Amino acid sequence: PTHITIGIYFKPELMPIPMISVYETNQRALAVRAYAEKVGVPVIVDIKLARSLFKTHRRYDLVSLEEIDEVLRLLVWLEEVENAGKDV
């Protein structure tokens, strides 16, 4: 696939582990990006991570122990980043 788009669902109020919400390649991947941008859902261009989630997981999986720590680091990072901009 020349383009990849993997979506992460995470709501700890409901469920402790994150989930693969979106899974698409090529044209559909481009459309997912355009739609997340339009609708305000953050897009992180992380090639190694995109590539390996694509290889290891499928739509609607829970994130497995192999990749969980990396995904969790991204999620904490995003929350911190939002918080830095939430007081300014």
Partner: peptide, 20 residues
């Protein structure tokens, strides 16, 4: 067009999208 309402919904409910 190319994304169904299901996937749109799935995007809306995601924390993030990881892309290459």
């Amino acid at each position: 067009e190319i994304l169904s309402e299901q996937v749109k919904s799935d995007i809306e409910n995601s924390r993030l999208i990881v892309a290459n």
